[PDB]
Structure 1
Amino acid sequence: LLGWGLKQAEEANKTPDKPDKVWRIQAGKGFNEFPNKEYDLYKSLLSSKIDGGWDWGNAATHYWIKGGQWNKLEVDMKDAVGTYKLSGLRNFTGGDLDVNMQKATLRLGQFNGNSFTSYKDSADRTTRVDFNAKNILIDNFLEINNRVGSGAGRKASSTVLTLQASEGITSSKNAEISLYDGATLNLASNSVKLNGNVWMGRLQYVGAYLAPSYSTINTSKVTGEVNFNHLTVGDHNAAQAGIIASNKTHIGTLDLWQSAGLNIIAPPEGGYKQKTEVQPTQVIDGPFAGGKDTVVNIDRINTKADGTIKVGGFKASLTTNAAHLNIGKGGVNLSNQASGRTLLVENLTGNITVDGPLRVNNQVGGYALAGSSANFEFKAGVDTKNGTATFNNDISLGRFVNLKVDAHTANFKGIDTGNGGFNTLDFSGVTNKVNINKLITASTNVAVKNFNINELIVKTNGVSVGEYTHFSEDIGSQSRINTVRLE
């Protein structure tokens, strides 16, 4: 209930754990002279001080390091040369790995993916699963803080994956990366191209529709190219993920859920850098601003909306501190359920540049039923109040759909509402200019404080009466219409 602004903030500056039994496996000679051998690494090295077993009750496998789930395993290679697959390291509970592999190639899957899970003990420890490879090359799916078995047994606390490649990370096409309720992901590599399913947040349990499930992909140290392909947040819950990127972001398809959250957060302008007992200083931050060259190149925003009926919408929402929000040519789609779905495309310290066709039910017009008010929503520059919500592509509102823009200068190229009508075409937040270039109205509620709508179409709507072009608020001083056409 704290939110990802708090739930991630408690885990920033922590001591790792209290591990005893610091195992130090040093892979000496032999490994240091075969660059192309295709070692397995779980079996040719790591199964010595990693013991499997059985979790008695609802398990597939059971893993730790050595004698309980609170012992460190550190591997000191730093010069081993070759390539290393995992191919099945699943239900590793463990704790405190740091597989230190300079000039070594990794692979995290070959016919079988991996897992790095935690346990919810009385200490609530993060496993701190680390890696220090050169090329990681995910190549099959990876589930961090996954469900161990089926519901019961020793519950899964928060956990951390940390990766420190130095030359590149790709991913396979069906490599469904799905990190869950507490799982994070740091990166220190470049050319990150997670070209498969990236799934922040899910039902960790099959009956937990009330799951907060704050996850994180903290790519704050990526020195190169970030790229997703399939970013899908939210699955039958209020999965409100977040991303702390490295001041440049492109994602592919965004299939948001009904009530999914997202906090794409750039670095700042300067970037990043008995007895009484003194707890250490917890440094926490409020919502700051992204720097100048901070761009969020989302190219599709869909909506997965089905299931139950709530009395309002659900407001799938994102949040951005970056200086721009370039929502590309796929634009905005919205699956519509019986109630009236909502989409908060908020941008705190930036703009909103939607260059795409605003579809709904995957069509541009998109007629809707009586109770369904598809409340599209934009907030360009809330805390800076100089944020423009520019729609350089022609939008089209059908029936019972509600464009509302709360910006500083809402530029447009054409708004088409009159065919479906019943459109609360609000612009109440927009400070001075609502530069609509073309307007189609038959039964609309166009409430603009100040505008220059240089073309006006006022349509008829059959035999229905009381329904008309309706400037329901103040038109003001600098208003202007360069063409009126009553048809």
Structure 2
Amino acid sequence: LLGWGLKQAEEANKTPDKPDKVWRIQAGKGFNEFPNKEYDLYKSLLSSKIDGGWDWGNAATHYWIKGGQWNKLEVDMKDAVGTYKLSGLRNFTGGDLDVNMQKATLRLGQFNGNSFTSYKDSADRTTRVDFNAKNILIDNFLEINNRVGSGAGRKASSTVLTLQASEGITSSKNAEISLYDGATLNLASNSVKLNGNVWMGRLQYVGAYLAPSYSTINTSKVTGEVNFNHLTVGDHNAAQAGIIASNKTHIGTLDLWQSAGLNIIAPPEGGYKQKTEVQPTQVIDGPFAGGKDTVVNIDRINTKADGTIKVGGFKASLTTNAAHLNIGKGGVNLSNQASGRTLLVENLTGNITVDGPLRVNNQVGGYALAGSSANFEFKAGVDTKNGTATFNNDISLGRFVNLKVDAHTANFKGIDTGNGGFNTLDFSGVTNKVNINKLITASTNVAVKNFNINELIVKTNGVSVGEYTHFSEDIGSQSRINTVRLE
């Protein structure tokens, strides 16, 4: 109930832990003389000081460091040349690894994936699992802050999976990154390209359909080209995930949930940076503005929607305070249950440029029944109030689908609401102009403050009377319609 903006701002500033037993392993000779050997790295180096186990309660495997999870380790190679795989570390509780692998390609997968969990004990500890490889090449799945088995045993506390390679963190098609209720992860290489399922937020337990389930992929100083391919926020919950990117974020397929969130946040302009007991200064930021060339090219949005039926919508969001928000050719999709499903495409301090066709239930017109009033929503340049919502593509509304735009000068090219009618075509927050080039209305609730719609179509709606194109606010001084056409 707290919100992600509090949670990540208070979790990104902690002390790690109090680990006694700092095991300090170091790779000696033999490792640093075969550039192509394809070592294993669990059994060949680590597995002396990482032990398996069985939990009384939902166990398959159980890994920690040595005699309890409150122990560190480290691995200081800095010269061990090769190519090192993990291949099969499942339900790792552990704590405070930092596999410092200079000049070493990594891999985290062969024949089995991975997991990185902790336990919700009386300490409520993190894991702070670092790596320092050369590439990374994840190449199989990974379950950060997962469940042990199902329900039994214990609860899981938070984690961190930092991954600070120096050549480019690619991935595979079958590499499902599944970070859950508590998990974050930094990255600091150049030109990430996660070509697989990024799954922010999941049902960590099978019955917990009401978890907040935050996360973060704070790709904070990625100096090259951030590139997702398949982002799947949320699963049967209001997963309020977030991303603090580095001012160029091409993504591909977005698959939200009904009620899950997203906070793609651009950098600032200059770039980032008895006895009374005194806690340290828990600094917390507010919603700030992007820099200038902050690009977010989310080129396909989908929104799955299945489950029970509530009294209203669910309104998945993506607060995006970059100074742009381009949305490409796949445009906007939605899926509609019996109640009207809702998408909230905000922008705090930027523009919006949707060049793609609006769909709902994946068709261009998108008819919907009277109870399922699908609600599209755009907020271009909110806290600067000079933000435009340019829709450079011909949109199309079927029946009982709802547009609203709260921008400064919401330009357009083509609007099709007269095919179905019953479309709340709101413009209630427009500061000055709505420069629509072509308008089709039959039984519509157009309300524009000032415009110049240089072509008008006035359609009928069969036999229903009282339902029509009803302008319901001030048309005002500079308004204009260069062509009215009553069919």
Q: Same fold (TM over 0.5)?
A: yes
- Cα deviation, 1:35-62, whole Å, max 9, x if unaligned, reads 1001000000000111111112101100
Structure-2 separation of matches of 1:389 and 1:324: 10
Report the counterpart of residue 127 of structure 2 in structure 1.
127
Partner secondary structure for residue 177 of structure 2: coil
What's the CA shift for 1:149? Answer: 1.1
Hey, what's the Cα distance between the residues in 2 that align with 1:344 and 1:408? Answer: 17
| SS at 1:5 equivalent | helix
Query: Distance between the aligned counterparts of 1:112 and 1:223, measured in 2?
Result: 31
Query: How many Å separate the matches in 1 of 2:252 and 2:396?
Result: 24
> Matched residue of 2:194: which SS?
strand
User: SS of the residue aligned with 1:69?
Assistant: coil
- Paired-residue identity, %: 100
- Out of 195-204 and 151-160, give the one that drifted further: 151-160
* Post-superposition offset of 1:154: 1.4
Task: Name the SS for the 2:44 alignment partner.
Answer: helix
1:249, CA displacement in angstroms?
A: 0.3
**Deviation by residue 1:65-89 (Cα, 9 ceiling, x = unmatched):** 0000110011111111111111101
Cα displacement (A) at 1:141: 0.7
Partners of 1:225 and 1:463 lie apart in 2 by 56
CA distances 1:73-127 after superposition (whole Å, capped 9, x unpaired): 1111111111111110111100000000000111000111111111101010001
- The alignment partner of 1:268 has SS state of coil
Counterparts of 1:287 and 1:49 in 2: how far apart (Å)?
44
Residue in structure 2 matched with residue 415 of structure 1 by the alignment:
415
> Secondary structure, in 3 states, of the residue corresponding to 1:474?
coil
Q: Distance in 2 between matches of 1:435 and 1:405?
A: 13
- Separation (CA, whole Å) in 2 of partners of 1:68 and 1:228: 37
Return the alpha-carbon distance in structure 2 between the equivalents of residues 371 and 461 of structure 1.
Answer: 19
1: CA distance, partners of 2:192 / 2:332: 25
Cα distance in structure 2, aligned partners of 1:241 and 1:151: 23
1:389 positional shift:
0.6
Q: Give 3-state SS (helix, strand or coil) of 2:143's partner.
A: strand
How far has the Cα of 1:440 moved from its partner?
A: 0.5
> In structure 1, how many angstroms separate the alpha carbons of the residues matched to 2:274 and 2:75?
39
Matches within 5 A, 1:145-156: 145-156=145-156
1:223, distance to aligned residue in structure 2 (A): 1.1
Q: Distance in 2 between matches of 1:383 and 1:258?
A: 26
1:361 matched residue in structure 2? 361
Q: In 1, distance between residues paired with 2:364 and 2:204?
A: 35
State how far apart, in whole Å, the 1-side matches of 2:172 and 2:113 are.
11
Corresponding residue SS for 1:32: helix
CA distance in 2, matches of 1:311, 1:486: 38
In structure 1, what is the Cα distance between the partners aligned to 2:105 and 2:269? 35
Q: Who is 2:282 aligned against? A: 282
User: Structure 1, residues 267-291: CA drift from partner, whole Å, max 9, x if none?
Assistant: 1011101001111011100000110
User: How far off is 1:424 after superposition?
Assistant: 1.1
1:342-374, CA deviations, whole angstroms, 9 ceiling, x for partnerless residues? 111000000111100001100011111110111
Residue deviations 1:207-229 (CA, integer Å, cap 9, x gap)? 11111000000101111111111
Q: 2: distance between equivalents of 1:128 and 1:241?
A: 19
- 1:287-316, Cα deviation, whole Å (9 max, x unpaired): 001100101010011110111101110001
Aligned equivalents of 2:464, 2:47: Cα separation in 1: 76
Q: Deviations over 1:378-430 (max 9, x none)?
A: 00011111110110000011100111111111000011101100111110101
Note the C-alpha offset of 1:152: 2.4
Structure-2 residue corresponding to 1:50:
50
Q: For residue 312 of structure 1, give the secondary structure of its aligned residue in structure 2.
A: coil
Looking at structure 1, the residues matched to 147 and 327 of structure 2 have their Cα atoms a distance apart, in angstroms, of 34
SS of equivalent to 2:178: coil
Give me the whole-angstrom Cα distance separating, in 1, the residues matched to 2:231 and 2:345.
Answer: 16
Structure 1 residue 460, shift from structure 2 partner: 1.3
- C-alpha distance in 1 between matches for 2:290 and 2:448: 31
Distance 1:278 1:463 in 2: 74
SS of 2:195 mapped into structure 1? strand
1:153 deviation in Å?
1.5
Cα distance in 1 between the residues matched to 2:104 and 2:175: 22
Indicate whether 1:253 and 2:270 are aligned. Answer: no
Aligned-partner Cα distance in 1 for 2:149–2:119: 12
Deviation of 1:455 (Å) = 0.3
Residue 407 of structure 1 aligns to a residue in which SS?
coil
Distance 1:76 1:473 in 2: 69
For structure 2, the 5+ residue unaligned runs are none
SS in 2 for 1:9: helix
Q: How many residues align structurally?
A: 487
C-alpha separation between the residues in 2 aligned to 1:71 and 1:202?
29
1: CA distance, partners of 2:257 / 2:164: 31
Determine the C-alpha separation between the residues in 1 that align with 2:472 and 2:11.
49
Residue 207 of structure 2: aligned partner? 207
CA distance in 1, matches of 2:274, 2:55: 38
What TM-score, normalized by structure 1, do the two folds share? Answer: 0.99
Q: Deviations over 1:179-219 (max 9, x none)?
A: 01110111111120000000000111111111100000010
Distance of 2:158 and 2:476 partners within structure 1: 55
Give the 4+ runs in structure 1 shifted more than 2 A: none
Q: How far did residue 462 of structure 1 move?
A: 1.2
What does the per-residue CA deviation read over 1:13-56, in whole Å, with 9 as the maximum and x for residues that have no partner? 11110000000111100001011001000000000111111112
**Structure 2: how far apart are the matches of 1:153 and 1:55?**
7
User: Counterparts of 1:149 and 1:319 in 2: how far apart (Å)?
Assistant: 35
Once residues 474 and 12 of structure 1 are traced to their aligned partners in structure 2, the CA distance between those partners, rounded to angstroms, is: 48
Give, in whole Å, the separation in 1 of the partners of 2:251 and 2:394. Answer: 23
Deviation at 1:174, TM superposition (A): 1.1
**Structure 2 residue 438 is the aligned partner of structure 1 residue 438:** yes
Aligned-partner SS, 1:47:
helix
The CA deviation string for residues 303-331 of structure 1, in whole angstroms up to 9 with x for no partner, is 10111101110001100110000011000
- TM-score when scaled to structure 2? 0.99
- Please report how far the alpha carbon of residue 147 of structure 1 lies from its aligned counterpart in structure 2 after TM superposition: 1.1
Q: In 2, distance between residues paired with 1:438 and 1:263?
A: 34
- Report matched runs for 1:72-471 at 5 Å: 72-471=72-471
CA-CA distance at 1:251 after TM superposition: 0.7
Cα distance in 2 for partners of 1:384, 1:155 equals 44
Alpha-carbon separation, structure 2, partners of 1:158 and 1:233: 19
Rounded to whole Å, the distance in 2 between the matches of 1:25 and 1:461 is 77
Question: CA offset at residue 148 of structure 1?
Answer: 1.3
Gapped runs of 5+ residues in structure 1? none
